[PDB]
Swiss-Prot record, chain A:
The extracellular N-terminal domain (NTD) endows NMDARs with a unique capacity for allosteric modulation, harboring several binding sites for small molecule ligands that act as subunit-specific allosteric modulators of ion channel activity. Changing residue 10 to G: In MRD6; decreased protein abundance; decreased localization to the cell membrane; changed glutamate-gated calcium ion channel activity characterized by decreased glutamate potency. Primarily found in the fronto-parieto-temporal cortex and hippocampus pyramidal cells, lower expression in the basal ganglia. The chain holds residues 404 to 439 of 1484 of the full protein. The gene is GRIN2B. This is Glutamate receptor ionotropic, NMDA 2B.
From Swiss-Prot, chain B:
It comes from Homo sapiens. It is found in: Cell membrane; Postsynaptic cell membrane; Postsynaptic density membrane; Synaptic cell membrane. This is Glutamate receptor ionotropic, NMDA 1. It is linked to Neurodevelopmental disorder with or without hyperkinetic movements and seizures, autosomal dominant: An autosomal dominant neurodevelopmental disorder characterized by severe intellectual disability and developmental delay, absent speech, muscular hypotonia, dyskinesia, and hyperkinetic movements. Cortical blindness, cerebral atrophy, and seizures are present in some patients. Glycans are attached at residue 22. NMDA is probably regulated by C-terminal phosphorylation of an isoform of GRIN1 by PKC. Its phosphorylated state is influenced by the formation of the NMDAR-PPP2CB complex and the NMDAR channel activity. Belongs to the glutamate-gated ion channel (TC 1.A.10.1) family. NR1/GRIN1 subfamily. A hydrophobic region that gives rise to the prediction of a transmembrane span does not cross the membrane, but is part of a discontinuously helical region that dips into the membrane and is probably part of the pore and of the selectivity filter. Changing residue 3 to Q: In NDHMSD; likely pathogenic; changed glutamate-gated calcium ion channel activity; mutant channels are activated at 10-fold lower glutamate concentrations and 13-fold lower glycine concentrations. Component of N-methyl-D-aspartate (NMDA) receptors (NMDARs) that function as heterotetrameric, ligand-gated cation channels with high calcium permeability and voltage-dependent block by Mg(2+). NMDARs participate in synaptic plasticity for learning and memory formation by contributing to the long-term potentiation (LTP). Channel activation requires binding of the neurotransmitter L-glutamate to the GluN2 subunit, glycine or D-serine binding to the GluN1 subunit, plus membrane depolarization to eliminate channel inhibition by Mg(2+).
Length: 36, 49
């Protein structure tokens, strides 16, 4: 099933970063996460 | 010990050294551009930093 998950950026638990300038998508061991 | 004045903890134990794991301005390590070492670290997941 598909379910939405909230997330807050803090500490090594969640680190957010911009998309890869080289590959153009999420890097290795990284998943996308939107933001309003 | 003062006569020789040798500073230990300078040799790197390997790629598993904690100082190598994190970046720092005091310690600079690098390789040759466009070689096999570049694509070994680029493809690795743990060695992102």
């Amino acid at each position: 099933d598909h379910l939405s998950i909230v997330t807050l950026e803090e500490a090594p638990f969640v680190i957010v970063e911009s998309v890869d300038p080289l590959s153009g998508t999420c890097m290795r061991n990284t998943v996308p996460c939107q933001k309003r | 010990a003062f006569l020789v004045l040798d500073r230990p903890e300078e040799r790197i134990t390997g790629i598993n050294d904690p100082r190598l794991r994190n970046p720092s301005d005091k310690f600079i390590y690098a390789t040759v551009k466009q070689s096999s070492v570049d694509i070994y670290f680029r493809r690795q997941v743990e060695l992102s930093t």
